[PDB]
Amino acid sequence: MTTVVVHVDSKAELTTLLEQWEKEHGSGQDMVPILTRMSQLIEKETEEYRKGDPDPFDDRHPGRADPECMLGHLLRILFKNDDFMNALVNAYVMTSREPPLNTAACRLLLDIMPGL
Amino acid sequence: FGESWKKHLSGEFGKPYFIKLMGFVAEERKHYTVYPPPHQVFTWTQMCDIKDVKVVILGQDPYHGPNQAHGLCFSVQRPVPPPPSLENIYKELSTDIEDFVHPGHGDLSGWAKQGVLLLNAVLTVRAHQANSHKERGWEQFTDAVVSWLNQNSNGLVFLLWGSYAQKKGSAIDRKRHHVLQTAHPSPLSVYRGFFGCRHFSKTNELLQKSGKKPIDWKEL
Amino acid sequence: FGESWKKHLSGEFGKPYFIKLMGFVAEERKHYTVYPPPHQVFTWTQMCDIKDVKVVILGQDPYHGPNQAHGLCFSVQRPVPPPPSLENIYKELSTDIEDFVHPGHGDLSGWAKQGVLLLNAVLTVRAHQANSHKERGWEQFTDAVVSWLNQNSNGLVFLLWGSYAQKKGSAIDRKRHHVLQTAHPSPLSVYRGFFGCRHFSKTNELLQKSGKKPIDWKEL
Amino acid sequence: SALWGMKSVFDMKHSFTEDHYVEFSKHSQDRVIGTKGDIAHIYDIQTGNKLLTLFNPDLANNYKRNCATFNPTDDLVLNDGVLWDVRSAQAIHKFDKFNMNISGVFHPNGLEVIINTEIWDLRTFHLLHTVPALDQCRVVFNHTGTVMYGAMLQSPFGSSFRTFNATDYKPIATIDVKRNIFDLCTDTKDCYLAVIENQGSMDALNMDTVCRLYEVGRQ
Amino acid sequence: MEQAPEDQGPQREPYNEWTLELLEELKSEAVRHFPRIWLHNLGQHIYETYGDTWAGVEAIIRILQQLLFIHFRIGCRHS
C-alpha cells in the first residue's frame, strides 16, 4: 500500500496530461507537442523497466504481472479508457490525412502496443 | 438538482454511508464506466416535483449497455428499441384503456409528468455489467427517501411487483395508502399473476379513494 | 382492558378481518381449547401503560401446555419451571450486570413495569398444539399496533431476534429509534451471534441517546 | 415435420402436425412415410394425402422409439417390428421383442431385418445371428451398403464409435471420441463423417454441441 | 456448382414480438413436463445475471430449448 516513488511522481506527470485532453472537448488546439510525452513518458517508463532483467515472454501487462515498478502502475490507467480515448482511435484514423494529423495517431498506437 | 425536493432531505447527508457513495462511485467514474452520468441521475428530481407524487414504482437494476438508459426506472432512451417488460406492460394497457395509443419508443418522458415516482433503487451500475457493485450506498439513500414520503407527501400507491420491491416498501400503512402487488412485468417470471390483472385502472381508480390530481395513461 | 391504550386504537375494529378474529377464536373457544383465556390476553394492555413503552420485544408462538403461559411473550407462569430460552437470556445478563440476581421462576412480572412491550404476535394457540391455526387475524391486529407506535409513542428499541421478528418491524426509521438484531435466544439456533453479544446494555444505554424513563434489569 | 423445398425457393411444400419421424421411400422417392407413436402413415409428395395408414392393434410391440422405414425394394415396412406387405395392406410376421427401445431397420441387401441386436431373415424368419455390440446403437450404412456405423445411445451418449461390416457383422473399429456423440451422418462418396459432439461435461444446463468432420481412412 | 436456395421461408421480422409470441410458448410446454421449481429459479438466476436486457430473453429460449430437446432425447416420456 501507498507505494510512492522517491523521484518526481510520474503518475502525477500522467494525471496532469489527463486533465488536458479530457478537457480538450474541441478546445481548438493541436496536441502534437504535448502528446510526444505519451511517447516520452512511457519510454522514460521503459528506460527504468529494464532494471529488473525481465523475462521477454510477457505479452500481458505488468499491471496484471508486476506491481513493483512504475510500468504496471501506469498501464492500467490509460488502458482503462472508458470508451473515451477509444474515440481517438476512431477520430484520428477516419479523419486523418495531414502529417501532423497523423503525428497524434501513429506515434500513439505503438504507445499502446501491448494494449493493442 | 431540484432544491424544493431537499426542503427536508438535508437529513440525507450526515450518515456514515453517504460519503461512501458519492466518492467511491465518483472513484468508479475515475477508473471505470458506471453507465448513467451525473446529469442523468437527477432527472426524476428535476422533471416532476415532489408536490404531485402519486405512484411509487421501484426499479431494480439499470441498463448496462452504452447509450441506453437515462435515470428513470424501467426506462431507456428514445432511439433505443423499447425494452420487453415495458413492452409487456403495454399489453394490459390495451385491454383496459379503450383508447389505447402507442408510444413507439422507449423514452418515458410522457408518464413522468403525471405523478409516478419512476425510481431506480440502485441508480448507477457499470457499463456492460449488470450487478457488479456491492451496497455502496444507493439503497439506504433511497430507503431514507421512500419511507420519508410516508410522512410528508401523500396519495401514493405501491405496485411493488417482484420480490425485490417487496422487501423495501411493504409495511407502509393501508389506511392512508393502498398496496397491491402481483407477479413481475417480465415474461421471464414463470409463476404468473401479472398476465392479466387490471392493476392499471387503479392509478386512475384508487385516486378516487383520495381525490387528488388526476392521471391519464395516454400521454405518449 | 386498558381504556387509555384505545385512546386512538379505535381504528383497530373496522376492518374485514377483526370479526374474523374475535368470533372464530371464540368459536374455537366454543369447540376446542385455545390455551390462553380472555383474562390473560389483556395483561400487557393492563399492567403497563402506553405512556412508558421503551422496548419492543416480539413473541412468535404461545405455550400449548396447560397451566403454563399468561399472555406476555417469552413468559410462563411462576410455578412452571422456567423456559430454556428465557433461561438462555439470563446467561448474558450475568456477564453484563455485575450485580446479577436470580429470578428463580418463570413469571415475568418484574420486567413488565419497566418499559418493555412483551408482545406475542399470535396471542392464542390451541392446547397441546403449537401452530395449528391459520392467520385468523392475530397478526395484522398487531401489525396495526406495532407500526402505529411509530407515530404516537416514542423511545422504542427493536431487538428483533429471529427471522420471524425481522419481517414485522424492520423498516421503522433509525433517526428516531435504534434497531439491532442478532441470532435467536434459543440454543436451537445453530448459526450463532446471540452467544455473547452484550445487547442487554443497550436497553440502559440506548436510552442515553434519548433521555427518557430509566431501566433496571434487576427487578426480579 | 415439414417437407421443405430446396431447388431454389424455400417453402413448406407440404405440412405435417402429427409424426415424430418422417422418412422417404428408398428407390422410387415419390413416397414419404412418417410415424407417430405406434401409428405410421404413408404419404404422397404430389398431393400429400394419407395414402395408406397401417396398424394392427392385435400385434404391435409398442417400442419406445418406433421409426417405420422401407426396404430398398419399396415393398416392406418395419412398423413396431412387424413387416407389412404394401400391395394389399396386410401384416406378415411379428418379431419377438427384446430391448424396449428400437423398432429395427432393413439391411441394404434386401435379405435381412436388423432389430436392435437380433439379425433376422426376410423369407424364413429365422434368427441368424446376434451381435451384442449392437446394444442400443443407431445404425448408418454406407451408400454402397458395405459397412455399418454405430453410435451409442445410452446419462452419456456415444463415448466412441463402432465400425461394422455389412456381410459378417465383424467389428472393425471402435475409435475413441472423448466427447459425447449425438448424431452421425456420412457421405455418399465415402470421405467424411458428420459428427455432432458435445463439449464440456455432461451438462444439461450448458450444451456446446459442435460439428467435427473426420476423414475416412487416414491415420 | 450448388446453388443454395432463396430464403423465402417464414420470416420473423418482429423479433421483439415473435419472441413474445413464443416465450410464453416456451413456458407453455416446460410446465407441461417439469415442475415450476427449476423454471422460476433458473429464470431468476439469469435475471440476476442478464436482467431485462434481451440477453436473458433469448438466453432462456436458448436454455429451455436446449433442455426440452435433450429431455425428449434421453428417453423420458415427459420429463
Swiss-Prot record, chains B, C:
Changing residue 188 to A: Markedly decreases uracil-DNA glycosylase activity. Decreases the affinity for dUMP-carrying ssDNA and dsDNA. Loss of uracil-DNA glycosylase activity. The keyword Protease does not apply. GO terms for molecular function: damaged DNA binding; ribosomal small subunit binding; uracil DNA N-glycosylase activity. It is an enzyme of class 3 (hydrolase). DsDNA binds at residues 64, 85, 163, 184, 186, 189, 192. Changing residue 188 to R: Decreases uracil DNA glycosylase activity. Increases the affinity for dUMP-carrying ssDNA and dsDNA. The active site is at residue 61. Uracil binds at residues 60, 74, 120, 184. GO terms for biological process: base-excision repair; base-excision repair, AP site formation via deaminated base removal; depyrimidination; isotype switching; negative regulation of apoptotic process; single strand break repair; somatic hypermutation of immunoglobulin genes. It catalyses: Hydrolyzes single-stranded DNA or mismatched double-stranded DNA and polynucleotides, releasing free uracil; a 2'-deoxyuridine in single-stranded DNA + H2O = a 2'-deoxyribose 5'-monophosphate in single-stranded DNA + uracil; a 2'-deoxyuridine in double-stranded DNA + H2O = a 2'-deoxyribose 5'-monophosphate in double-stranded DNA + uracil. Changing residue 120 to D: Acquires cytosine-DNA glycosylase activity. It comes from the Eukaryota. The keyword Phosphoprotein applies. The modification N6-acetyllysine is found at residue 202. Disulfide bonds: none annotated. Changing residue 61 to E/N: Loss of uracil-DNA glycosylase activity. Its EC number is 3.2.2.27. Keywords: Acetylation, Disease variant, DNA damage, DNA repair, Host-virus interaction, Hydrolase, Mitochondrion, Nucleus, Phosphoprotein. Uracil-DNA glycosylase that hydrolyzes the N-glycosidic bond between uracil and deoxyribose in single- and double-stranded DNA (ssDNA and dsDNA) to release a free uracil residue and form an abasic (apurinic/apyrimidinic; AP) site. Excises uracil residues arising as a result of misincorporation of dUMP residues by DNA polymerase during replication or due to spontaneous or enzymatic deamination of cytosine. Mediates error-free base excision repair (BER) of uracil at replication forks. Monomer. Belongs to the uracil-DNA glycosylase (UDG) superfamily. UNG family. It is linked to Immunodeficiency with hyper-IgM 5: A rare immunodeficiency syndrome characterized by normal or elevated serum IgM levels with absence of IgG, IgA, and IgE. It results in a profound susceptibility to bacterial infections. This is Uracil-DNA glycosylase.
Curated annotation (Swiss-Prot), chain D:
Transmembrane segments: none annotated. Induction: Up-regulated in a number of cancer cell lines (at protein level). WD repeats lie at residues 16-53, 55-87, 88-130. A motif (DWD box 1) lies at residues 82-89. The modification Phosphoserine is found at residue 155. It is found in: Cytoplasm; Nucleus; Cytoplasm, Cytoskeleton, Microtubule organizing center, Centrosome. Residues 1-130 are annotated as: WD repeat-like region. The protein kinase-like region mediates the threonine-protein kinase activity. The DWD boxes are required for interaction with DDB1. Belongs to the VPRBP/DCAF1 family. Acts both as a substrate recognition component of E3 ubiquitin-protein ligase complexes and as an atypical serine/threonine-protein kinase, playing key roles in various processes such as cell cycle, telomerase regulation and histone modification. Probable substrate-specific adapter of a DCX (DDB1-CUL4-X-box) E3 ubiquitin-protein ligase complex, named CUL4A-RBX1-DDB1-DCAF1/VPRBP complex, which mediates ubiquitination and proteasome-dependent degradation of proteins such as NF2. This is DDB1- and CUL4-associated factor 1. It comes from Homo sapiens (Human). The chain holds residues 1161 to 1392 of 1507 of the full protein.
